[PDB]
Q: What sequence folds into this?
């Protein structure tokens, strides 16, 4: 089997992407944030504290004839950005772009933190990291991809995120029309439960490539590119007027400035992030100070190849017995 779904930016800045997901019988369609950095499929629901729901579409398990309470199960998650949610668990039928999993754990939120309430466009998350990170207790549950894997034509999914435009998540096949050149595959460590890999280096604009190992995660659920402070400093030093603002919480730059591209290495291959992808607009409405899309990972404890990086590539998440990641230009 295969599936194919369009993913759409939630706003004009590509702060996140939402993909429609059918849950239950009859189908209830929710727009979920596909997150290769986590491993829980959780949704706003009829069980979510009323004051914490503000425009989201909810899953109502009592209206699904295929929903079954996962008795005794609870879940609770905290994300790198400080947000969190928790609740109980049902199993139900979940379909993405034509691909159907029966008995998928659907984690129903009883509580969500303010950032989730305040974002009316995201109805939940669909985790695509390794199932070892799943927070359901007492019995850890599998991701949608893990459940689908054996049925797929090939045990892979691909992320093809758009710049200021829709893109595509595919399951079970590689669309050879969706990228240029070849796909370069690189080793993955699953030891922390992430799609963790090692970039071979970077270049800033037309500068020479610096060969240096950068360990990080391919994370569709993180907006920006977070890299070591040395790398980030070298980038922003090429932007006139850029500075790191402690009050804002990262590098900002005058919108009148031209942003250089940023190149990262995948083996001997190179992915070029165009300068425009690194512009995240005014820090506040009407401000001439713009927020940068490449920021320091210092104090995150890991480097994160978030959407800024991934949207410059066609990315293969290969769930073969020994997982790997593939990157192509597009």
A:
């Amino acid at each position: 089997s295969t599936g194919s779904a369009t993913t759409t930016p939630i706003d004009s800045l590509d702060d996140a992407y939402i993909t429609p997901v059918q849950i239950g019988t009859p189908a209830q369609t929710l727009n979920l944030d596909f997150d290769t950095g986590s491993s829980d499929l959780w949704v706003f629901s009829s069980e979510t504290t009323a004051s914490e729901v503000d425009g989201q579409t909810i899953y109502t398990p009592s209206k699904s004839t295929t929903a079954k309470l996962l008795s005794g199960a609870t879940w609770s998650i905290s994300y790198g950005d400080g947000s969190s949610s928790s609740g109980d668990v049902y199993t139900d039928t979940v379909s993405v772009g034509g691909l159907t999993v029966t008995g998928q754990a659907v984690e129903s939120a009883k509580k969500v933190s303010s950032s989730f309430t305040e974002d009316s466009t995201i109805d939940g998350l669909l985790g695509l990291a390794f199932s070892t990170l799943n927070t359901v207790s007492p019995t850890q549950q599998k991701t949608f991809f893990d459940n689908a894997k054996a049925s797929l034509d090939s045990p892979v999914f691909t992320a093809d995120l758009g710049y200021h435009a829709p893109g595509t998540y595919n399951f079970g096949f590689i669309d050879t029309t969706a990228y240029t050149g070849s796909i370069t595959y690189t080793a993955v460590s699953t030891k922390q439960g992430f799609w963790e890999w090692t970039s071979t280096g970077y270049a800033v604009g037309s500068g020479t490539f610096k060969s240096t190992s950068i360990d990080g995660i391919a994370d569709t659920g993180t907006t920006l590119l977070y890299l070591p402070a040395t790398v980030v400093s070298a980038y922003w030093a090429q932007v006139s007027g850029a500075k790191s603002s402690s009050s804002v919480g990262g590098y900002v730059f005058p919108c009148s400035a031209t942003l250089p591209s940023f190149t990262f290495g995948v083996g001997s291959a190179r992915i070029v992030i165009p300068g425009d992808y690194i512009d995240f607009g005014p820090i506040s409405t009407g401000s001439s100070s713009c927020f940068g899309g490449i920021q320091s990972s210092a104090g995150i404890g890991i480097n994160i190849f978030g959407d800024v990086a991934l949207k410059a590539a066609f990315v293969v998440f290969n769930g073969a017995t020994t997982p790997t990641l593939g990157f192509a230009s597009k």
